[PDB]
């Protein structure tokens, strides 16, 4: 429960990332960066 791109890089599923509240499932990623991750002010859903 602390920084929510934290949180979302737990996940590490697609199916629940995308669902997961202000968390969206980075589909291609190089080798360093994380697929679950924090989408920013990409939600916009409270």
Same mark, same amino acid.
């Not at 890089?9 to 589909?27: L, R, V």
């Not at 994380?34 to 859903?45: D, E, L, V």
């Given at each position: 429960?602390?920084?929510?791109?934290?949180?979302? =890089?737990?996940?590490?599923?697609?199916?629940?990332?995308?669902?997961?509240?202000?968390?969206?499932?980075?589909?291609?990623?190089?080798?360093?960066?994380? =697929?679950?991750?924090? =989408?920013?002010?990409?939600?916009?859903?409270?």
């Amino acid at each position: 429960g602390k920084s929510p791109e934290a949180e979302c =890089n737990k996940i590490t599923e697609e199916p629940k990332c995308s669902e997961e509240k202000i968390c969206s499932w980075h589909k291609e990623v190089k080798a360093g960066e994380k =697929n679950c991750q924090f =989408n920013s002010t990409k939600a916009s859903k409270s």
